[PDB]
Design an enzyme around this catalytic site. Structure first.
Site, PDB file in Angstrom:
ATOM      1  N   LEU A   1     -59.925 -11.328 -52.768  1.00  0.00           N
ATOM      2  CA  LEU A   1     -59.232 -11.309 -51.479  1.00  0.00           C
ATOM      3  C   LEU A   1     -59.725 -10.121 -50.629  1.00  0.00           C
ATOM      4  CD1 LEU A   1     -55.617 -12.359 -52.261  1.00  0.00           C
ATOM      5  CD2 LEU A   1     -57.474 -13.814 -51.410  1.00  0.00           C
TER       6      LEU A   1
ATOM      7  N   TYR B   1     -57.996 -10.589 -66.831  1.00  0.00           N
ATOM      8  CA  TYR B   1     -57.841 -11.880 -66.165  1.00  0.00           C
ATOM      9  C   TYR B   1     -58.404 -13.032 -67.001  1.00  0.00           C
ATOM     10  CZ  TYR B   1     -56.692  -8.776 -62.377  1.00  0.00           C
ATOM     11  OH  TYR B   1     -56.134  -7.748 -61.661  1.00  0.00           O
TER      12      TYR B   1
END
Ligand SMILES: OC[C@H]1O[C@@](CO)(O[C@H]2O[C@H](CO)[C@@H](O)[C@H](O)[C@H]2O)[C@@H](O)[C@@H]1O
Ligand code: NA
Length: 283
Positions: free
Chosen positions: A189, A52
């Site tokens: 999340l 990422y």
């Protein structure tokens, strides 16, 4: 208390939580403090490759390896000449003379696959690397490397919210290869942060994310459920959860060291969560 798993059929035995995807900062003294704590926690797998868009400073990692190289499994990432020249650069910065796991990023089915495989095999024969693997969520790339190469690992985004890898687990496992997980908490999340209003995740809409957080078992923290769901698959050797502090690393360690899911808990999450598949690059 940190358990290890064999990485594919390789001789590498990697901690179930691996370290990467954390900034070590500008101060070398603070960086080395962070790394000492990581290693003290029993994490022995360090991937310096960008996950990422966050990697590990190789010069700092190199200094942390000093006097204990043999106790650490070091992974990095990267036509034959390019693949060779690249690992040389990492080794110089890392101040070591071999990488345990060298991984291909950005592979496609249109690459020179024999040339690529040959490059890795020559580095492995010469002892510059011990093993190689890929980072890919493309089934067509995965199938080619499993058929044609001796990769030992495939790094994949995988979590309760992104179950697309699961379709390929039987094939991967049949080849004696392991998965290394990135994104096991779905970038936040599957944790305590709010779901940003109106935003989704892959094929989940906001309302479906909200509903799933509520419907998932509440006898474990969501963060723990997420990491243990990944680990409940034997093909998974290690999970590289994101962290931006030593506190977050310790939180990841505690969650990975918790009791494994039972068969029942796993089947329960399997029913509740979507089971999507990759749409692209399948063949
Ligand atoms: O065909 C509908 C079927 O697809 C699923 C897959 O998880 O939901 C997708 O389709 C819905 C309707 O377009 C979207 O609301 C949802 O976000 C999306 O994942 C099933 O839930 C549904 O039965
Ligand atoms: Na299939």
């Amino acid at each position: 208390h940190m358990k290890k798993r064999q990485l594919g059929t390789s001789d590498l035995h990697v901690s179930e939580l691996g370290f990467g995807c954390m900034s070590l900062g500008t101060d070398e003294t603070k960086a080395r403090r962070i790394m000492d704590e990581v290693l003290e926690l029993g994490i022995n797998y360090l991937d310096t490759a960008d996950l990422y868009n966050q990697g590990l400073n190789e010069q700092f990692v190199g200094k942390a390896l000093k006097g204990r190289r043999q106790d650490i499994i070091l992974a990095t990432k990267v036509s034959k000449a390019y693949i060779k020249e690249a690992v040389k650069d990492s080794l110089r910065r890392l101040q070591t003379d071999y990488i345990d796991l060298y991984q291909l990023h950005g592979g496609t089915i249109d690459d020179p696959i024999d040339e690529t495989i040959e490059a890795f095999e020559e580095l492995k024969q010469e002892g510059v690397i011990r093993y190689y693997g890929i980072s890919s969520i493309r089934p067509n790339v995965i199938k080619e490397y499993l058929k044609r190469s001796n990769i030992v690992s495939i790094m994949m985004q995988y979590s309760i919210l992104d179950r697309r890898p699961e379709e390929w687990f039987p094939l991967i496992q049949e080849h004696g290869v392991s998965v290394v997980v990135r994104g096991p908490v779905a970038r936040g999340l599957l944790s305590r942060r709010p779901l940003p209003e109106g935003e989704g995740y892959l094929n989940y809409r906001y309302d479906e994310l909200k509903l799933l957080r509520e419907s998932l078992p509440t006898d474990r923290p969501l963060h723990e459920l997420a990491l243990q769901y990944c680990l409940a698959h034997d093909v998974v050797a290690t999970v590289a959860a994101g962290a931006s502090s030593i506190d977050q690393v310790k939180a990841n360690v505690q969650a990975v060291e918790a009791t494994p899911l039972t068969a029942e808990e796993r089947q329960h999450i399997q029913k509740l969560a979507k089971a999507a598949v990759y749409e692209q690059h399948r063949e």
